[PDB]
Amino acid sequence: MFKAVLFDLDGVITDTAEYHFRAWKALAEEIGINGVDRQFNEQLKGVSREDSLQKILDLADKKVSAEEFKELAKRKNDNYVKMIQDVSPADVYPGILQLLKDLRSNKIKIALASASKNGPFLLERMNLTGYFDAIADPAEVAASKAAPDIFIAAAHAVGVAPSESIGLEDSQAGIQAIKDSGALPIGVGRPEDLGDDIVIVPDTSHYTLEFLKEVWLQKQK
Ligand SMILES: [Mg+2]
């Protein structure tokens, strides 16, 4: 049976994406650009901070100096760090706490395999830190899209081979990263968005220990 579960943060454990939307909107207002709304924020999903900022400037066909660009980018991040002080245990997605408890009670290792620069802080805010055996550090290993490195680091950090591990992800490039790590992916979301070949659940409430087991046993057969 699998010895570890490697968790993505955003889309699996919780939603960081709403706080980002509020950070960008605050910057947009602050510099006087209309049109940053939930509809527009959807075009920032999986987009770099620098690309996202450029798209916001494009709303007013605005050109800024490289130094100004850099200061706006920084301020969005400051806004974000400010927004996320309100993260709490109410942000934890359904099923996730029970899963962590069940994994832990069965001595299965729990690692975070996230590109989030605020991972440890966010796990603290959500009161999940005690369940986590390691957090892979994205500053040390490339967690840039589809790189298995973050997943490989997360497995190793709890003393297992990726081959002994399940990875949970909500994005196609996440699922690819898990596969190239040698871990077994289980996706959360819509068939249409993730892939033909992999097991997928429609939401995090379906991530149960019993279900992960059944999937591990059907990989092995
Ligand atoms: Mg994600």
Curated annotation (Swiss-Prot):
Binds 1 magnesium ion per subunit. Autophosphorylated. Optimum pH is around 7. Relatively stable in solution within the pH range of 5-9.5. InterPro entries: B-phosphoglucomutase_hydrolase, Beta-PGM, Beta-PGM-like, HAD-like_sf, HAD-SF_hydro_IA, HAD_sf, PGP-like_dom2. Its cofactor is Mg(2+). The keyword Cytoplasm applies. Mg(2+) binds at residues 8, 10, 170. One of its GO terms (molecular function) is beta-phosphoglucomutase activity. Its main location: cytoplasm. Catalyzes the interconversion of D-glucose 1-phosphate (G1P) and D-glucose 6-phosphate (G6P), forming beta-D-glucose 1,6-(bis)phosphate (beta-G16P) as an intermediate. The beta-phosphoglucomutase (Beta-PGM) acts on the beta-C(1) anomer of G1P. Glucose or lactose are used in preference to maltose, which is only utilized after glucose or lactose has been exhausted. It plays a key role in the regulation of the flow of carbohydrate intermediates in glycolysis and the formation of the sugar nucleotide UDP-glucose. The catalysis proceeds via a phosphoenzyme formed by reaction of an active-site nucleophile with the cofactor glucose 1,6-diphosphate (G1,6-diP). The phosphorylated mutase binds either G1P or G6P and transfers the phosphoryl group to the C(6)OH or C(1)OH, respectively. This is Beta-phosphoglucomutase.
